[PDB]
Point group: D2
Chain length 203, copies 4
């Protein structure tokens, strides 16, 4: 699927209807995707991943930093599947940051393996284009990408992930490990940042 | 606060986007309020409840059967607040059911247990408001210190007698919904999301 | 299966290592079964129930008041299996209390799961079992979070934990209506017994 | 003093029969016993989060995750801290990750989050680097601390569980990269040890 489509005229939710940390009370305009909705969608993505990749060992590759929450949660739902079903296949994990690929195991660990790349957001698609090209230099057996969010944008190079949580307008969103200048990662919901927030936290 | 307002024209979500019990697959039309959204809203309600009612022993009254899930979850969020704050208050629980013949209270403790306590009535849905006005009239006779009502859902309807609860999860259109313990002829309680039921479904489970 | 066997000499855990409501700080002696451990065991019980009772339609019967938490959580784990795995319920629910308030009068030809907080003398369970059986169900099974090792003049089909003959409270189990608002199962202290004595 | 000493697990702790829990099929033969149930980890971590906030909540916290084994404890501990921050009076928090085989820290309350302390060498090594970014304060939370005469004597500030000298896996802790995808902390069978060395 293209995922849960959040349309351009999505009002999202007033902050006052949810529990929000006091230190961000002025810096957010609206809740855009409630944490629990992310959980529900992620539960279903875990099933789609297993239906598609469950027949072999998987190396799940977390794209730090923004990917960390989605990754942990997605893997927790896969694990729940694995321990309540007859069949299960093991998973190993690894972590990388992009700048060139930094950190992470020798990517020869991906050689001949089924790789699941887990990302927070695809925008132009350039980052994923680049990572896919890098990973493929190490001859994995299979590579699929899961991204919590995919933006509708004219800048898209035309790359589309295999698993997508939500398809969103081109608004700047933060929360659930997504940041604005390292802030807002410590927020459970995805939210649209306000202009006041953009100015307080700009570098 | 009328709660999270769901508009008349809200399409809900395609079932294929979520994990749905197989046995209800063609009995539902859309997911209307995802479970997780109910959880997030309930977390805020627990905080609102403690702000108003946390000053004295609370008796939380579950209106069975449809109230049971919202009750368990709301109380769990309240317990989480109470074991992570400096000071806390005891909470006791009871369960009642209202039976239609005219409407009367079935079960529960002797209601003298309510005397002098902060009573929180927890309901799945307010529609006409007649059930709650009835329950409130009974409860008040036992002189609680205060009595407040939390309802997961409140329906916008012309048939409303004008009762509004103190705490509201979601304000919804005049559509028939099921899930999260709300039923259609006892079915659909075993579903985590609030959903709208299909034509195939209403027919299948019809009395 | 007798469930998770908690030995007679089990010391439990210091309260100060867990999150506990301050209003019960002096009323508990030890944490006995941490909430999270109840969840882990309950997850496995849900799978055992579905292995044995699914799929025909199940009516899950909640024995109030103490069974309410175990019932809600066990049913949540069963629902998780119903939407993620290769098998299904449907389930309907009812709630009974012994004081027999509620009940719908429904059980005939159905698979009935009685859900109980604790078996001690076994008397509530015998009563629930002669009830239900009068409506000729297709099958009856009993799930009990706790079973005490104590003399008992039916063995439950699904057991969370087999515990010593100690008075425990928490996870909806009460002492004179108190301690239901505690997520862990804990052993009540002497000062707790005196404070909330009726 | 240890700000939050841990659940002491005795040398003769027998753990739990695997058959009493939900275990991934692919590890059914490779594990011997459940040692620390996932849910027990969660309950301890909840109290740990409160202890952290009591000690460090007066100023911006930077939580530093020590990959790979620390990732689960880190995600969960931070989730509990976040819950405290939104149901209260709150303090901003930022995250970073480091792996052993950062101006984000300067002037802030740094919480290093680790899976296990054994000899203490790794933590002493890491501390000696982190201090060079001149934090306001540095604290270490470790899910597990092993009782070993081999301990160089280093003690973290927040401890989940103090365990005997046994090899454990699960909750992101690995044996040669295996067993990370397991929610419980477990002791590894003889067959799993030989199979994955
Ligand atoms: O709405 C947004 N919120 C937060 N970040 C956003 C957003 N849109 C684009 N970005 C940047 C996302 N990424 C930024 C890449 O760098 C991320 C490093 P980290 O913050 O450690 O996860 C680019 C995606 P593409 O190559 O497809 O254009
Ligand atoms: O959309 C709906 N879904 C499920 N049930 C609905 C709905 N609308 C009204 N109801 C009936 C709710 N109640 C029905 C009362 O009976 C209790 C239902 P149960 O929890 O299954 O024992 C009426 C409230 P009021 O007096 O304000 O009109
Ligand atoms: O250690 C204990 N803690 C709390 N309650 C205990 C305990 N032992 C027996 N009981 C009484 C349990 N009751 C439990 C059944 O119903 C629960 C009544 P309530 O939860 O207070 O509305 C009877 C057990 P049985 O009929 O097998 O003898
Ligand atoms: O029981 C165990 N299970 C898993 N690993 C264990 C265990 N005991 C020591 N270790 C090695 C842990 N660490 C190993 C560090 O490197 C491995 C980090 P990762 O990438 O998470 O696998 C040594 C700590 P210290 O300097 O205090 O001796
Ligand atoms: Mg990214
Ligand atoms: Mg960024
Ligand atoms: Mg109702
Ligand atoms: Mg009804
Ligand atoms: Mg009972
Ligand atoms: Mg009792
Ligand atoms: Mg480590
Ligand atoms: Mg290792």
């Amino acid at each position: 699927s293209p995922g849960v489509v959040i349309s351009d005229d999505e009002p999202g939710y007033d902050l006052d209807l949810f529990c929000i940390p006091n230190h961000y009370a002025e810096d957010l305009e609206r809740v855009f995707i409630p944490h629990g909705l992310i959980m529900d969608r992620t539960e279903r993505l875990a099933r789609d991943v297993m239906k598609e990749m469950g027949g072999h060992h998987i190396v799940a590759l977390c794209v730090l930093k923004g990917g960390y929450k989605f990754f942990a949660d997605l893997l927790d739902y896969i694990k729940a599947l694995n321990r309540n079903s007859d069949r299960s296949i093991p998973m190993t994990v690894d972590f990388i940051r992009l700048k060139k690929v930094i950190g992470g195991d020798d990517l020869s660990t991906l050689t001949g393996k089924n790789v699941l790349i887990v990302e927070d957001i695809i925008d132009t698609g350039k980052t994923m284009q680049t990572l896919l090209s890098l990973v493929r230099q190490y001859n994995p057996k299979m590579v699929k990408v899961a991204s919590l969010l995919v933006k509708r944008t004219p800048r898209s190079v035309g790359y589309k992930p295999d698993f997508v949580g939500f398809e969103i307008p081109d608004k700047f969103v933060v929360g659930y490990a997504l940041d604005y200048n390292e802030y807002f990662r410590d927020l459970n919901h995805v939210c649209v940042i306000s202009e006041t927030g953009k100015a307080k936290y700009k570098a």
